[model samples]
Each structure stands twice: as C-alpha cells, then as structure tokens.
Target: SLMYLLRLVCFLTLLGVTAALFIFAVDLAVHGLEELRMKISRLAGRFAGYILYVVSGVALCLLSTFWCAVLSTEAEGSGLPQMKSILSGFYDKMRSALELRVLFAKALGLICAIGGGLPVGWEGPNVHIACIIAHQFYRLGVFKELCTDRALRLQTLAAACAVGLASSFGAPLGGVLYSIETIASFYLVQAFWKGVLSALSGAIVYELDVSRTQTLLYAILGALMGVLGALFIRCVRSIYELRMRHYPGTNRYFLVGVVALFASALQYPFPRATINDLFKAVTELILMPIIKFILVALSIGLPLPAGVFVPSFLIGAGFGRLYGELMRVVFGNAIVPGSYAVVGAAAFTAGVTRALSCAVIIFEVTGQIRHLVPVLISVLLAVIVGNAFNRSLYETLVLMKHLPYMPILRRDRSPEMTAREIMHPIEGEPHLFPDSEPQHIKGILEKFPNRLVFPVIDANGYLLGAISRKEIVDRLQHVVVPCDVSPIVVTSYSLVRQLHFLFVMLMPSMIYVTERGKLVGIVEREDVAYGYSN
Candidate 1:
C-alpha cells in the first residue's frame, strides 16, 4: 500500500513535468512556425503569402494528425477505450513489442500531424502520448516499484489524462472528468486522489510556464459552447457511422482526408482565409463569422486526423466576434474584436468538449479573464444540450467501434438493474466500528472470510469510513500509516448517474451504505465490475 501511494506520487510528478515541457514545446513550435511564415510571405510578395500560408497550415495539420494518429493507432482509437480493454483482460497485446512500435509512431505522428496544420486538438493526442510514455517506462522497469495490474493501468491512465488536459488547455478538472466519463470502470478514493494530484501538479506547472488568465463570463460561454460542440461532434459521428454502414469496405478514410485537404486548400484562394489573413477580417462585422464556421466545420468533419476542439474554438470566436461587431453596429461602440474572439474561443471550446472546467483552462490559455458570467452560462447550456443529445465525441467513437469493452460496461441494456439496484443489499459481511482497532478489524475480517472491505461505523451506526482487510493489515504492518483515511466509500441509494459521477470522482474499491448511522450493507468492487463486464 505504501509502495502504491509512493508510485502514484512519482507518476504524477512525472506526468506534471512531461505535460509542462510538451505544452511549452508546442507553444514555441507554433510561434516559430508563424515567424517563418511571415518571413516567407515578405520574400515572395502576394503569391508568397498564399504559398507560405498554405504550407504552414498544411504542416501544422499534418503534425497534429501524426501525433493523434500515433496515439489513436497505438491504442487503436481513444486512450480511454484502450485503458478499459487493458483493465478487462481483453488485450494483453498492449504489453508486447507491437505496443512499443505504436508508442514511437504515435509520438512521431502527433508532432507531424499537429505541426502540419491539421484541425485536430492536442487533448486526445496528449492523453495518448502520456499513456504510451508511462507504459513504456513501466515496461522498461522504471515503474518497477509499483504493481503492474489493471488497477495500476487505470490510475496511470487517469494521471496521463489529467496531464494531457492540463498541458493542452490548462484545465485540470476537465482532465479529471475525461477519465471519469471515459476511462474509469469504477470510481474509487485512490483514483480520485491520484487524479486530483496529477491535475493540480500539471496545472501548476502549466501556470508557471505559460500565461494563465480567464474570465468567469468567458468560462460560462465556453461551457455553453461545449454542449453545442459536443452535439456537433455527435452528429458528425453519426453521419460518419451511417456512411460507413452504407459504404462498407469502401476505404473512405482517405476520402475524408481529401475533402478536408480540398476545403483547407480552398481557403488559400479566398481573401483572409489564410491564418494571417484571418486577422484582417477580425473587425469585419458580417463576413468573418459566416466564413469561420463554414471553414471550421469543413475542416473538422473531413477525414483528417485533426480534432474538433480547436476548430470549435475558432468557430466560437468567429461567432462571438460577429456578435461583437453587431453590437458595435447597433451601439456605435463595443469591446475589441480581439477580446470577443478570445471569449468566443473559450465558449466554443468548453461547449464542444462538454468541459465546464475546460472553459476556464482555455480562457487562461488565451490570457483573458473578462466577461466570465456569460462564458459560464454558455458552457452550462452547451453541456446540458450536449448531454441531452447523447453525443459525447469520445464515447461516440467507443460505441461506434464497439471496441473491447470495459470490465464494468454501462449502456442502456440493463437500465432496470442500475448500479443502485446491485449495491443495495449484502449480509454476513464484516462491519467495523469507528473506534475499532486494527486487531479488532482483522479479527472481524477473519470471521467474515471474504476479500471485501467492511463499512466502518460509529457507535450510533453512522458511517465513518471503509475498513478493508488489506488496508488494515498494511497499516498495522508499517506498510502504510494509520493516519491515512481510506477514500473509497459510497451510499446505498446512489443513483446510476451518481454512481458514475462517484466512480469518476472517488475511484473507490467498494461502496458502503448506512441507515441512521448504522451499517446496512456493502457494495464490493467485484460486484460493480461484474455488472459492467458483459
């Protein structure tokens, strides 16, 4: 237990450092590329400007895609699915040589695809990269101090995801939810702690190394936009899936790529379509928003490996800028276009990502912190709407592919027997009193004769905490300190949605229940695992 805790600390530290470095490197690369494009445009005149713009855009796209593809192919799609599969014993091949190749490829591909000007965002790629890097270290004996099990993998994945989101957008909470909504099979205390630590570490490093500014209004807007963006992503996925069904064996992945490439290329010929040219119409009231949305949708929906997150930001910014322009037209005075654009970026990013916390992160990334209330409102609306549509981009990918499922899968299949139903009852389990000593707990465990943890309660039967035999023995044996309160505990009446939330938040080993402060029942991790492992 001590070793596990120590290992988690070390892994989180590594994740923080890696995230900071990667984010800094990407920033430098983006700025350097922009400078290079400027110089080329100057040398070649008007034609040179077009050429440089296209080249730079293409380069960035390719770089983003390369990295995204590496991560995608290595894990065979999203990091969450692979982690789920690994935990469920569905894919031991991840431990083999093939995984190494995938790791290297993913790293290389992410750099190239992103650098090449793909429309994809770095969030998914970063998670993929972090996992690959951590897994590689584990395989190479760097993480030998830790147990290499499905549980460990889950922890690592959560840490990696936190690092990914923190690095990408400076949003640690989004990273936390990223794991909960996608990767976590069960929410437990350990998972929550690891996730929180990883996120805090990464965010701290990001803030120190990069500018961090965000307005509450912008964050709200971002959240609202996140919901809309999520819906858009879902719609795109549905379209893509429907198309694939009809065009089975059509090998249309490249076709999607071609369409994206063509759309991007068209932007080259249009005035202000290029990256630099985008700023020229920043003040233009009518044209900017319309063109921006069209271009973003075209670029993102196409088959390229680019992500929808960045494009959503661009679209939102464009729309916000347009709104600002309209305001100016009516009022004859308004906020700067640049400012509105920044707010829009946050709103769009938050809306599409279904990330409330992410809105703040993106706002920070852009170094703006005004109009926070509106931003928050926008994000909230977007999330609510997106959830209503059942259109989470990551989940959509997982469901569409029907990949190796998690150990505790939850679909609509058994809605009647929700997580709440399964956790409501158990008998003959060891129950611990709040004041019970380690020896007393052990004695009780011996009588129960199960691997399950007991519900620790007060004299009045009020729940205190969970007392697992493993934890008790470890604490007594000097493997762990007695002062450490166990984090995994759940109530009996927790609804499925609440269970899902807790699984994301707590990542506990078991769920315990008490009525009127007396222990009533226990929900073992195995039971939840069995519920999901179809």
Candidate 2:
C-alpha cells in the first residue's frame, strides 16, 4: 500500500527529472550562444569580428560533430529517422547504441553545435536527446517491469519526445501534437495523457520567449518566403554534396568553416547584422535569411549533431522581420512590426516543414493570441507554395535514407495509382542475378539491415524471391536452400492509385508457389517498377 505510493512518487519525479535535464541543457544553449554572439559580434572591428565569429562557430560545430565522427556508432545527425524507424518496429538494435555516453554526447554536442550558431534548432534533436535519456533508463532494468510491452516502450519514448518539444519551445500543447505529428504514427489514450503530462511538466520548467507588416506587403513577403522556403528545402539536400569524398575529416570541417566563414562576411558591410539573436528587422532582412540558410546548410553538411527548428525560425524571421520593418516604413506602426516578424517566423517554418501546426506553435511560443489570424494565413499560404517543391523536410530526409518505414496514408492513397508508379529507382545498387550466391546475400543482408523487406531486389533493394519465416523453416527441413546460408516471410500485388501501400511495402517480392512450396516467377521490386514504367 505505502510501497505503491512511494514508487509512484519516485516514477513521477523521475519523469520530471529527465524532462528537466533535457530542458535545462537546451535552455543553457539558448542563452549561452546568445551571449557568445554578443561577446564576439565585432572582434577588433567589423570584418575581424565576422571572421572570428564564423571561425569560432565552425570550431564549435566541429568539436561537437567530431566526437560523433570519431567515437560511437551512427550517433550523429538529428537521429529522428532512426528513432522513427524504431517507432515503426524495425530498428531494434539502434536502441542499444543509445547508451549513456551517447546521451551525454548528443545533449552536450547538440547544444554546442547550435550555440556555436549553426542555424540549427534543438527542436528535432530534442526528440533524440529525450529518447537517449529514456533508452538509458529503459536499459537500466529498473523500469523494465512496467515497460515490458513493446507498445509501452514506444509510448514511453513518444512522451519523452513530447517533453522535448514542450520544453524546447515552452509550448506544452505543441509538444503533444509533436508526439502525434512526427513521433507516434498512431494514437493511444495512454500516450496522450503521458505525453500531455510530460509536456505540461516541461512547460512548468521552461519558457521561450517573438513580430508585423502591410496587408499586400505581408502577402508578397509570404510569396517570397514561399519561393525562398522551396529553394531552402530543396537545396538543403545538397548538404551531402558539399563534403569532400577524398578527405573525410580535415576536408569536411574546413569546408563548413570556409562556407560559413564567407556567408557571414556578407554582413560585414553592416557589421551589426547578426543571425541567431532575432528579437525582431526590414530591407537588410532580405539577404539575411539566405545567409543564415547557407549557414544552416553548411552546419548540417557534416554529419554533426544539431537541430534546425530555431535556425529555421531564424531564416524565416530574418526575412520576415525585415519585411515587417519595410511595411512599417511604408504603412506605419498601425501594423505591429513585432507581429509581422512573428508571422514571418511562422511562415518560413511552415514553408520549409509544410505544416500548419507551425502557426499554432508560434502562438504558443509567444503566448500571444492576437496575431493568430495573420500568422495562420501566412503559414497556410506558405505551406501551399512549399509543398509544390516537396513534402516536409523530415519526410524527405527519411525517404532519402531509405530507412525501414512504411508510408501510412494521411487520408487515402488514390487506388488509381500504382506503387510502381510512385516509387523511385535507387541509384548505384547492382542487380541480383541467377548467379548471386549465399555469400552475396550474406553481405547485403549484413550491410543494409536498414532495408525493411529485402527485395528479391536487384531492383532498388530486393532479391528475386519471396521469403516466409514459415516457408523458409519448411524449406530448411527439406533443403539447405540459399545453398547453405541466409534468411526468411513477408509479399504480393504492388502498384499506384489502387495499390495497398502497406501490402506493397510488406510484400516486396512476388513468388509463385503451391501448398507444397514451389517457386516460379520471383518478381523483383524493379520488375514492378519497370512494369509500371513502360
């Protein structure tokens, strides 16, 4: 009786503690970098300060990134896609990599990288850090009794990530929505309460603290950000290209240093212009978003651990702030310049991420309901424009990496479309042939475990055969199959409009067999794509 009460108290307090540690580190970063910028805004003079700031900033990014680069498993980047993969029940071992050391590194490195002014945000990394903390505790075995079920473990993490969002922006509601939007693919009553509880507690511990414009002027600025956001969204994929394949470490760091080094110098003429410390600006704001954009691009270019939420806000706000300022000059303060800046920040974020929720996030972030109308209008319009270029950045990156995630329809996938019609051909992978050996299958399986259903791939990723754990077990009893090596179930009809995405993803290969187990046409993934292609 008393025992349950005490443990319950301890459990609740532990949640508060984990949430606090994540929030406090992020808070330190929020202020630490701002202070760093203030200190170095103008070193000896304008040009010197610009060079010094960018160099030091680059150094900080490297210091954080290099640790991951040098130590540990894939402990870099936002770790969102990996986490998402795990959420979907594929990347089981990825959790083991989420050790205590990784948590410290991510929390420490993410803060430094962002603080160094990489134009990234802790918003995305916040989820990863939160997960790392949970993984630490989850592995501790103390929480194992209650969290034994897979869904419960995933739910615990979803709430931890919610806590990340709540504290990061000081928006408790947004955090819960974040758990829904990006982290959890499905909803559960328990997840909501836990996430909301963590989110509320996070807000209790943290707060964040945001702008205006002419009617047509705001409309026009929205359109330009629509353009800029599209460009930024598409062009950011070029981050991988900036690296030197020849020299991994040395070339990588220096390249980022040099790019940001000059990008910041664009402001040297007007030395006071800065990127991250955006309280509220106009004409000069035009170029700043781009400058800051490239800064973020370069910062993320190397596989360093940082975030893009605030940096993204910076990009949108920089331009939005200036647009608001220009509107003020022409139209007057009848429109609060601050309101315009605020709207711009949300618009920019909406355009990049293509989410209307960003509109709500901005309001919650500032706790100002008055500007909701314009901000919502701008975000909706920006989303329309940006989506024309691509889906949200998170979706795009996840797809590009080919992480083992199945696409769940937001509404309904048009049945008229074929899976073959929509799926793109992956570059550079060789085809699986009749001569393909067990050794070959072993290497591919070992190397690309990230792939969900190994295609009877030679297509993008498949083998020319369908596998069933049962069928394989049966086959094993009769034959040494795969010629003494390699592994097993899971295929079927694949296509577009009418195609079942889950089915297509689940069933990558088409095998013809009988109850006796016979195979004929082992359709590869490319066969399906090629069938649609012609």
Candidate 3:
C-alpha cells in the first residue's frame, strides 16, 4: 500500500514537472524564433523569412528524432511493440527506474527531436517515455500501497499509451481507444480508469499549450482519412514483408538505408534538410512516389530499430497529395490536396500500425477533420489489408527471433494460473539426483535431446537443481571433473505470474520443482520463456 501511494505520488509529481518543462520550452522556442525572424527580416526581408521558415521546420524534425533516440534505444520504435514485450515478460536488466531518468530523458529527447526536425513522430515515443517515468516513480519505494511490480507495469503501460496518443493528436477520447486497442490487454476497470486519466491529463496539457479548437471540416476529414489511412498501412506492410522474405540480409539493410538517404538527398538538396521540404518537393510530386515507396519499405525492412509511424505517414501523405493533384487536374476541382494529405496520413498510419483508433488519434493531432469520411475509409481499408497480410509489427519481430510472442487481446481471457499448471513436466526423462556428481549429470545430458534441460531431484523426489544440455557439453569438453548439478527449486504453488516474474527478472537458466521431496518436473529457462506467451 505504501509503495503504491509513493508510486502514484511520483507519477503525479513527475507529470507536473514534465508538463511545466514542456510548456516553458515551447515558449522559449516560440520567442526565440520570433526574435530571429525579426532580425532576419531587418537584414534580408522576404528571403530571410523564407529561410527562417525552412530552418524552423527542419529543426523540428531533427530534434524529434535525435532526442527520441537518446531517451533509450527502446524508445525508437512504435511503443506498442515494446509495451507488448514488457507485458509478455520481456524487460531490460538495467536498474534505471522507468519514471524519472527514462521519462525525463524521453521528454527532453522528444521535444528536442521534434524541435530538430527528424523524420520521427512523437506519439509512440511519448507513451514509452511517460510509462518509464511512471514506472520509475513506482519503483522509488514510495508507492507500496497500490499494486505489485507487474500491476504497476501494466498500469504504466496503459497510462503511457493514453498519454502518447493524447499528446500526439490532442484527442483524449481517441487516445483512450488507442490504449484499449493496443496497450490495455486485460481490459479491466482499473486499466480503463488509468488510461482515461493519463489521456485526459495529456490532452488537457496539449490543449493548454496548443490550440483546442478545430474546424468541423477537420473532424470529418479525420474520420475519412482514418479509413484511407488503414488501406495505405496495409499496402506498405504487404510490400515490406514480401521484400524482407526475399532479401533477408544485413547488406540489404544498408542498401535500403542508402536508398533512403539518396532519395532524401535528391528531394531536399540541402546540407541539412527538413521533413517539410522533403514532403513539399519530392513526396508531393508523382515522379518520386515509387522512390518514396521503396525508401519507406527498405527503412522499415532493415535491421535498424525504428518506428513505422512517421515513415508511413510521410509516404502516405505524399502519395495522397500527388494523387489528389492528379485527380484535380483530371476531374477539374474534384479534390483538394490538403484534404487528400489528411486522408493519406490516416490511411498510412492505419496500414502500418493496424490501429483504427490510433489513426483517429493521428487525425486529431493534425487538427484537420474536414475529410474524416475519406480518412475513415482509407484507414478501414488499410487496417483490413495490413492485418490480413502480416501480424502486428512487435509480434512479428518477437516470433522471427523465436522469442515469446505477446498477443494484443481485446478482453481478459480468465483468472491467472500457476506454474504447475503451465509448465511442461519432465516425467520419463533421465534425471539426476541432487546428490549426483556433475559428471554423471553431464553423461545424462549427453544422451538427451539437443535443447533439453535436465531436472535434478533429491532423495525423496523433490527438485533440487537443473542442468542444460549445452552446460553439460561445455563442462565435459573443458574439464574432466565431477561437478555438483543442482537446480533452483521453486514452490509448486507459485503463481504462473510470479514464476514468470522470476524468470524474466532473474533470467535464471533453470528452475526446480518438488512434490513432498519427490521431483515432479524440472522447468528449463527456455521452456519457461517459450511458455510465457502461451
């Protein structure tokens, strides 16, 4: 209870501090730009104004990407995957709390990254950063009253998801849905409340700092874009996955990067470029749509850790604008570029993330709802197509590595079970007693399956320790000596969640089981790891 309170306090306090800092920084940037603009106007008039506008836009993109990178490499991709991994028991060994250090780093990083003009978006990173901040606060020994580490992690994830969407799009309701659809797997009442609070806080903060009023047209456009955005996402993922299967090499990654760089260079042609310029010049033109498509496909398909949101947005918006222009030329005042661009953003985001709610959130962020019908259509198409062709990004990544895969559930499945129910019991396998010499255990493993982990039992059948096939092979190959092979015995009654916690938190190679001194089963780390998602 005490710990929980402390965590809540920590989260609340940090939220206040970060919000203040964000506001202050925004003010400083605004004033600084104004001053620079005045000085430039005095010196070079209209040309200086043009230069300032270009520079400011470029700066925003660089700042967003650079800071996002610095907060933690984990902050790079769409946070949905990282959050899913955490929920599924994947975590880093670092002692740094998620609340203070990580949150501060992400907050500053995101602001700076956005300010600097990197081809990155703020939505995913913000959630990760916020969750880290909230988690760190809970870890500070102040919040013992609320929940366990696992629960806290879940809450933080929910909060982070809400904050990410709200801050990015300025839509609290949409942000809540994003959390529901992406982060809050259990869908409990507590999760919903936390998500709502986090999103509301973020949305309020955004409104206070930015503008709350949006045109009705913008709302309509946003809904429309949501649909189209879904379709675009579908298309991109399909192409990227197909390409990845055919070209699965590191060299391909580098080549893809090279292509992206080349395309970027061709479009902007500046020593330092801004996303705005790239979008305005190259993406808006139909000639470069193919290049843009290939570049986006390669960037995401490469080995480098990056998010798909921004890249997809750029590609979709660019393509949409170009197509819109073509339509206008052909149909004579039938379509508007701005509206098309909005729809493209929704379609692309939906396609890449397969997030219907998130696509709506993106619409809110742009403050353009006039084309909501079109956006909704695009997003629906993109989402259906994307999901049909590929699994969610995070799930695919985890599966490719043969790691545990976390599913995004829309509802809770059931009450949790214990390790005894979930673990695979080694019944007939040749096992060694705890008193057995290490060499004997090695001999047993030699005859076992390739990836087998042997369970060590005591005199009365209680689990004492475990040995791995690899461990035995290594020990025998290196030294000809008897060794004590014992496994770490855990209570059979331990909750599955608890066992998972121990495995992930400690990363032990083996775990032991006992039934009144009789060895019932020996669970290997690999087995437990694999069993996590199941």
lDDT of each: 0.54, 0.59, 0.52
The true-versus-predicted C-alpha distance at residue 313 of model 2, in Å, is 1.2
Q: State how far residue 365 of model 3 sits from its true place (Å).
A: 3.4
Which regions in candidate 1 have their CA more than 4 angstroms from the true location? 1-5, 22-98, 140-142, 145-152, 170-186, 199-227, 247-257, 269-305, 328-343, 366-374, 405-534
Best by TM-score: 2
Candidate 1's displacement at residue 481, Å, is 35
Tens-place lDDT per residue, model 3, 1-534, is: 996556564565455345433534543664465466356545666756655555554444444444544555434444555565565544442223243545554555445433433344455555665566555545555554333665655565566656655554456777678667765445656666666665666555555501112233334434444454444444546665665587545342244334434544555622012223432422336645545555554444332223456666666666657655665576565344555555555566665566787556655554455445545555666666666656655455444333342332212222256557755576665666656675675566656656455555556665444456545667656652233464566767775556655665454545666555666665554444543333
What lDDT score is found at residue 280 in candidate 1? 33
Clash count in backbone of candidate 2: 39
Q: How large an RMSD does model 3 have? A: 10.6
For model 2, where is the 10-residue window of minimal lDDT? Answer: 511-520
Model 2, 381: alpha-carbon shift in Å?
A: 2.4
Which window of 10 residues has the lowest lDDT sum in candidate 3? 406-415
RMSD of 1: 10.3
Compared with the true structure, model 2 gives a TM-score of: 0.69
Root-mean-square deviation of Cα positions for candidate 2 versus the true structure, in angstroms = 8.7
Better of 1 and 3 by TM-score: 1
Off by over 4 Å in 2: 1-13, 29-56, 145-148, 207-224, 242-251, 263-283, 325-336, 400-402, 408-500, 503-534
